[PDB]
């Protein structure tokens, strides 16, 4: 029955069911699975067969087809000519820096005819094309469906979400890439241009090789005035639309106007369409219009019948591919183009309004599936266009050819590996042209950071741009993109993560929807006349105008009825009825971002007590989220369908008899807290904070150190950070149990006292308890891993050994006794800066070492040393070094509310203030950090933490709970013997006098960030030098120097310290002396030991001047002289 006042548990139970049935990288997994299941098949099958002749004759030539289909894909395998091949464990790939890839196979049928009319076709099964990198936890990954015990047996983390590639033993994550939706008409109005309005519809076939062929239909911005032009792909100039229609095949004018204005009784449309009509009253038949288009083509034909064919080809294939490319699709293309013109006229008259570019209904997300499809298609075409070349090279002589040698298996696998390993998304030749940032290295510092990096979108618009409109949070981001979570750098709003229940559609064929549609009462375009098209409604399927229906109602209900039972229409498909404007659109393509919503009838939910009961007893009745969807209780609603629907925040508070607001709801939200992301779902009371605080906390949640993964000891990984004693927060949101934050937490529930104790926390800093740090408070250990491989020439063989002084020539003062005789350190040996770790020497044509030295000022201990063979069969070693990081002053600490700060001082327990009991705060922060930041959520967290630690319960900090507030928390606290507002009477730790003011104190969940001070502190005193210009090197690792930049130079000018400026830029960087002739200001030649100073070109040898110069200045002068410029510097 109806469920009253049990919502606070029913909604979270169904949310738990959703997060049990679907994981957190479900979009990644589904996209990659759909790719490797069907998109690779369609890409490999739709490629045309290649037929190839000889060089047109031999004396005074037959061909073959070579068509292939039916792709086969196998599980990952690993060994080559050394043993029988065995499956690749992903952990083995990580350790050995392999590429966790899977070989794909096809069977080819080459049918060849030569002479005598005898056809023989030979089929080659399981032909090898390459090895495709495969995503972890995918449907063909070796970890698919394995139980937690098996995953632990394989040294894999059961909590690892997967969704990433292992390539060269490095995790790669395909960041989702935004783009404008395809096959849809957008009417825009750019401000400063020759034309006022422009309507574009970038078009794509069902994943064809052709790119987005974008067509614009535009209207001029002011004789006659307001002509309509349509710039066309592969056409240099704009073409008036009526000429386009006449070229398409409509000789008359009434027929053309029947495709644009659907109701002839509207004269306002005619008054604006006739200025374009009277522009082209000189073309009356199809061929002259074809000639007109061909003259404007990029490749202008020399004769008339060549322009005719070129323009016919352009109209047949380039323009509007999604509406069809076949023998006769002229009527459908004309209908769609007339619809585009009608859409432009509606915006020109103001009957409708301009479409919004930031409306994420108009956006599509390119996940792993679509991205790998786009890149594999190009590489596959490149493979075919080299099989063809090999075939030509053998058939010109005509002896025979072998497809096994013809197939170059390197290209596909190497292209995939390069693209995913580097991020340059495209061919390697166009490294600068291809967009970068895709397939980033997975951030593996915290589990929340890993989840956030696996759920991340990207807007491929240029950064450092002054147009803030794309960066702004759009209204259509509700519940699909986290409003709080975004980087604070130059990528604000451009890089945005994914909401919790937000799911990205994976795509399916619209054909079943088409056969379902064509059988109720609708008519295809070819059947009807435009007489009855004005009163009825236009149906769009994936953006292509399929037909016309007289009754929009009871077909909308029918489509919703089928989608709610999953009869023919799958759940991801979205049906959208625009009502004031008669379009009714159906979308099935991939990349549509959507989230689940409840179904609401008259004023009641379809979710019932019976649903909640049979789903609460899950793991026995297996009534999962999929069964809940099949029950017709929830739907997946994308942004398009979210425009035409009416939601309610809470069924109890928004579906009741009262002063009526809507009384016509259609959907309800499961819980509003699901609009947050992953890093923002760990914020307690996030609605009690200023939003920039929440953004900063979402950014710093990726930097808080903790147990980032369970198998961190088998995981030989560089820059690994784990905390000794992580704790789940005393006060938590109900959304953490789905992020598994209470299983892999990053932080300790510290007792903070928000007070000004001594002044060492004044400017946003913090005091720590030295005794707590001694007891292990926020103590962590830093793992750094070092890799090395021996090899590279004919005789320069790399080898691991202990370099011996009399044998090897080049050696540091570092002691090499710590090495074992095989050239490595045994694990468990204390190490420090400038200590050899891997003794590697190269033969000198006696020997020279290439030993790896421990990074300066690390001073850790070797944890474990692994030796193995890379994919080239050479010895490969990785060494991991432990180094614990005791919290010292300057280490960056932060809370769950964007209140960051470095430790300012550490007092012992005696020096630290204390309550009536012996409770001394672990942390003291400045109260002057609250009032401007307005992190009232921090104060409420500090209060609820005390309440929870006294009650024995775990505090609940769900954002929009509305069942807990400050008054209730205070009343609960007052029962345990404390002041109701959390204040306590602390005593001064030094004098013992009780502090006149009462101190606000309580347990708060603080986090330790990776930004330690020992990893940032560095100095320099005449260290190493760069090679090109003799200035100090750059970087902390290279013992570099700080940059006395152009603004510091200006500041010194303003100080008027000219001697200090010269000291900084000349002696402290690169003092240098050069010899210049007094006659010509050109640099001369100086031989100091013989004191022979001659300037050739003058033959003086006598009057020569020495001038002191920065080396950068000398090298600038030399570059100018190389550019034939003659900077002459006379000292007179």
**Which residues are marked as active site?**
764
Closest CA to 1080 of 1128, 1047, 1035, 1125: 1128
Task: Determine if residue 808 is labeled as part of a ligand binding site.
Answer: no
Cβ contacts of 1113 within 8 Å, gap of 6 or more? none
Given a contact cutoff of 8 angstroms between Cβ atoms, the answer to whether 215 and 252 are in contact is no
Residue with tokens 């794909």: 104
**Burial of 197 (C-beta count, 10 Å sphere; 0-12/13-18/19+):** buried
* Nearest distance, CB of residue 570 and other proteins, angstroms: 23
* Of residues 275 and 378, the one with the C-beta less far from other proteins: 275
CB of 919 to other proteins, least distance (A): 5
**Running DSSP on this structure, what letter comes out for residue 673?**
G
Q: Which residue, 84 or 660, is less far from other proteins as judged by CB?
A: 660
CB of 305 to other proteins, least distance (A): 25
Distance (Å, whole) CA 170 – CA 168 = 6
- The reply to whether 365 sits in an annotated binding site is no
Residue 114 CB neighbours (<10 A): 13
Closest to 920 (Cα-Cα) out of 725, 766, 753 = 753
Q: Which is nearer to other proteins, 415 or 552 (CB)?
A: 552
Pick 300 or 810: Cβ nearer other proteins: 810
In sequence order, what are the beta bridge partners of 1008?
893
Residue 1079 assigned ligand-binding role: yes
Within 10 angstroms of residue 372's Cβ, the number of other Cβ atoms is 26
Could you tell me which of 529, 526, 559 has the C-alpha nearest to residue 545? 526
Q: Shortest gap between Cβ of 472 and other proteins (angstroms)?
A: 6
Which CB, 370 or 937, lies closer to other proteins? 937
CB-nearer residue toward other proteins: 953 or 1067: 953
DSSP state, 297? B
Closest by alpha carbon to 1104, among 1083, 1129, 1077?
Answer: 1077
Closer to other proteins at the Cβ: 347 or 986?
A: 347
Residue 1078 marked as a ligand binder: yes
CA nearest 900: which of 994, 1024, 761, 783? Answer: 761
Q: Is 318 helix (H, G, I), strand (E, B) or coil?
A: helix
Closest separation in Å from C-beta 666 to other proteins: 5
Q: Determine if residue 1077 is labeled as part of a ligand binding site.
A: yes
Q: In the bound complex, what is the minimum distance in angstroms from residue 1102's beta carbon to other proteins?
A: 25
Residue 742 annotated as lining a ligand binding site: no
What is the DSSP track for 777-797?
Answer: TT-EEEEEEEEEE----SS--
Spatial neighbors of 726 by CB under 8 A, at least 6 apart, are 706, 707, 744, 745, 746, 747, 748
CB nearer to other proteins: pick between 658 and 917: 917
User: What is the rounded distance in angstroms from the CA atom of residue 113 to the CA atom of residue 220?
Assistant: 58
Provide the H-helix boundaries in 511-650: 511-517, 556-565, 609-616, 625-630, 639-643
φ and ψ of 737, to 5 deg: -65, -20
Q: Alpha-carbon distance 221 to 275, whole Å? A: 13
Cβ 644 to other proteins, closest distance in Å?
Answer: 7
Chain CA centroid to CA 925, Å: 36
916 annotated among ligand-binding-site residues: no
Q: Is 395 exposed, middle or buried (0-12, 13-18, 19+ CB in 10 A)?
A: buried
Q: In Å, what is the CA distance from 1059 to each residue of 114, 1044, 1046, 1072, 1111?
A: 89, 15, 17, 17, 18
**Nearest distance from residue 581's CB to other proteins, in Å?**
9
**Residues in Cβ contact with 951 at an 8 Å cutoff, skipping those fewer than 6 apart:** 972, 976
Give me the least distance between CB of 589 and other proteins, in Å please: 25
Q: What residues does 610 pair with on adjacent strands?
A: none
Q: Which is nearer to other proteins, 435 or 550 (CB)?
A: 550
Residues making up the annotated binding site are 1077-1080, 1095-1096, 1098
Residues making up the annotated binding site for Zn(2+) are 1077-1080, 1095-1096, 1098
């Amino acid at each position: 029955e109806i469920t009253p006042d049990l919502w606070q548990e029913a909604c979270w139970i169904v949310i738990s069911s959703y997060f049990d049935e679907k994981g957190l990288v479900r979009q990644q997994l589904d996209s990659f699975d759909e790719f490797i299941q069907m998109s690779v098949q369609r890409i490999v099958e739709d490629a045309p067969p290649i037929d190839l002749q000889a060089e047109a004759q031999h004396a005074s030539p037959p061909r073959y087809l070579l068509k292939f289909e039916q792709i086969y894909l196998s599980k990952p395998t690993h060994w080559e000519r050394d043993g029988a091949p065995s499956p690749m464990m992903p952990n083995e790939a990580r350790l050995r820096n392999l590429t966790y890839s899977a070989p794909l196979y096809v069977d080819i049928t080459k049918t060849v005819i030569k002479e005598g009319e005898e056809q023989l076709q030979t089929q080659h099964q399981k032909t090898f094309i390459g090895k495709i990198p495969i995503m972890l936890r995918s449907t063909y990954c070796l970890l698919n469906g394995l139980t937690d015990r098996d995953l632990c047996e394989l040294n894999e983390c059961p909590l690892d979400p997967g969704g990433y590639f292992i390539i060269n033993g490095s995790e790669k994550v395909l960041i989702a890439q935004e783009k404008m939706a395809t096959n849809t008409v957008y009417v825009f109005a750019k401000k400063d241009s020759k034309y006022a309005y422009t309507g574009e519809c970038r078009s794509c076939l069902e994943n064809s090789s052709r790119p987005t062929s974008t067509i614009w239909v535009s209207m001029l911005a002011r004789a006659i005035g307001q002509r309509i032009v349509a710039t066309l792909p592969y056409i240099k100039q704009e073409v008036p639309i009526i000429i386009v229609f006449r070229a398409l095949g409509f000789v008359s004018d009434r027929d053309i106007l029947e495709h644009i204005i659907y109701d002839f009784e509207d004269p306002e449309m005619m008054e604006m369409v006739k200025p374009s009509l009277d522009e082209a009253f000189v073309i009356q038949e199809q061929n002259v219009a074809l000639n007109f288009i061909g003259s404007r083509g990029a490749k202008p034909g020399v004769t008339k019948e060549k322009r005719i064919k070129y323009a016919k080809e352009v109209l047949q294939k380039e323009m509007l591919p999604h509406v069809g490319v076949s023998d006769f699709c002229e009527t459908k293309k004309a209908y769609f183009l007339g619809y585009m013109v009608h859409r432009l006229l509606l915006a020109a008259l103001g009957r409708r309004e301009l479409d919004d570019r930031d409306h994420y209904g108009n956006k599509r997300l390119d996940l792993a599936g679509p991205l790998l499809a786009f890149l594999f298609r190009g590489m596959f075409k490149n493979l075919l266009k080299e099989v063809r070349i090999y075939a030509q090279k053998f058939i010109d002589r005509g002896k025979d050819f072998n497809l096994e040698l013809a197939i170059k298996t390197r290209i596909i696998s190497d292209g995939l590996k390069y693209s995913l390993a580097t991020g340059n998304w495209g061919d390697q030749k166009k490294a600068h042209q291809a967009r970068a940032g895709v397939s980033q290295v997975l951030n593996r510092l915290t589990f929340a950071s890993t989840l956030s990096h696996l759920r991340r979108l990207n807007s491929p618009i240029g950064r450092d741009g002054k147009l803030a409109k794309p960066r702004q949070l759009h209204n259509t981001l509700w519940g699909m993109v986290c409003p709080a979570e975004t980087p604070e750098g130059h990528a604000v709003g451009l890089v945005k993560n994914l909401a919790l229940m937000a799911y990205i559609s994976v795509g399916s064929q619209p054909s079943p929807i088409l056969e379902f549609l064509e059988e109720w009462s609708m008519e295809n375009l070819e059947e009807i006349s435009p007489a009855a098209i004005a009163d009825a409604t236009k149906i769009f399927v994936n953006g292509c105008w399929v037909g016309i229906h007289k009754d929009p109602e009871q077909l909308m209900n029918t489509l919703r009825k089928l989608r709610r039972q999953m009869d023919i229409i799958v759940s991801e498909v979205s049906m959208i009825r625009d009502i004031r404007e008669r379009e009714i659109r159906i979308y099935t393509d991939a990349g549509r971002i959507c989230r689940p919503l409840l179904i609401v009838e008259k004023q009641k939910l379809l979710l019932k007590k019976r649903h909640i009961d049979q789903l609460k007893e899950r793991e026995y009745n297996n009534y999962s989220w999929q069964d809940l969807v099949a029950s017709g209780v929830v739907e997946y609603i994308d942004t398009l369908e979210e425009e035409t629907v009416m939601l309610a925040m809470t069924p109890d508070d928004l579906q009741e008899k009262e002063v009526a607001y809507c009384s016509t709801y259609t959907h309800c939200e499961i819980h509003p807290s699901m609009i947050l992301g992953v890093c923002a779902s760990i914020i307690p009371f996030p609605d009690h904070n200023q939003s920039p605080r929440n953004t900063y906390q979402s950014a710093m949640g990726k930097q808080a150190m903790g147990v980032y993964i369970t198998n961190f000891h088998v995981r030989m990984d560089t820059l690994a950070h784990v905390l000794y004693y992580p704790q789940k927060p005393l006060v938590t949101t109900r959304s953490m149990e789905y992020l598994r934050f209470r299983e892999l937490p990053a932080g300790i529930n510290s007792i903070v006292a928000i007070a000004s104790y001594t002044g060492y926390n004044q400017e946003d800093s913090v005091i720590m308890n030295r005794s707590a740090v001694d007891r292990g408070f926020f103590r962590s250990v830093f793992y750094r891993s070092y890799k090395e491989q021996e090899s590279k020439g004919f005789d320069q063989e790399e080898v691991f050994e202990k370099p011996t002084r009399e044998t090897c020539q080049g050696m540091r003062h570092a002691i090499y006794d710590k090495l074992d005789d095989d050239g490595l350190i045994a694990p468990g040996v204390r190490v420090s800066g400038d200590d050899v770790i891997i003794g590697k020497t190269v033969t000198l044509p006696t020997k020279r070492d290439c030993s790896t030295f421990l990074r300066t000022s690390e001073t850790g201990i070797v944890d474990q040393v692994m030796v193995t063979l890379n994919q080239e069969g050479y010895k490969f070693c990785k060494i991991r070094v432990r180094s614990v990081r005791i919290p010292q002053i300057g280490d960056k600490f932060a809370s769950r509310h964007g209140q960051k700060g470095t430790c300012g001082i550490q007092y012992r327990q005696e020096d630290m203030p204390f309550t009536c009991e012996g409770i001394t705060p672990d942390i003291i922060i400045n109260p002057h950090a609250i009032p401007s930041r307005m992190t009232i959520g921090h104060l409420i967290e500090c209060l609820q933490g005390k309440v929870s630690a006294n009650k024995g319960e775990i505090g609940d900090a769900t954002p929009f709970n509305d069942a807990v507030n400050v008054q209730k928390i205070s009343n609960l606290l007052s029962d345990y013997g404390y002041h109701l507002r959390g204040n306590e009477v602390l005593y001064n730790g030094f004098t013992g006098r009780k502090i006149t003011s009462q101190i606000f104190i309580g347990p708060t969940y603080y986090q330790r960030l990776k930004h330690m001070v020992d990893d940032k502190i560095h100095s320099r005193a005449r260290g190493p030098i760069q090679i090109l210009n003799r200035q100090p090197m750059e970087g902390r690792s290279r013992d570099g120097g700080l940059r006395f930049g152009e603004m510091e130079r200006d500041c010194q000018i303003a100080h008027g310290a000219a001697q200090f400026l010269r000291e900084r830029l000349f002696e402290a960087s690169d003092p240098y002396q050069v010899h210049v002739c007094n006659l010509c200001g050109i640099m001369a030649i100086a031989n100091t030991r013989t004191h022979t100073y001659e300037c050739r070109g003058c033959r003086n040898k006598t009057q020569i001047s020495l001038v002191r110069m920065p080396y950068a200045c000398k090298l600038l002068f030399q570059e100018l002289m190389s550019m034939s410029i003659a900077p002459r510097m006379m000292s007179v």
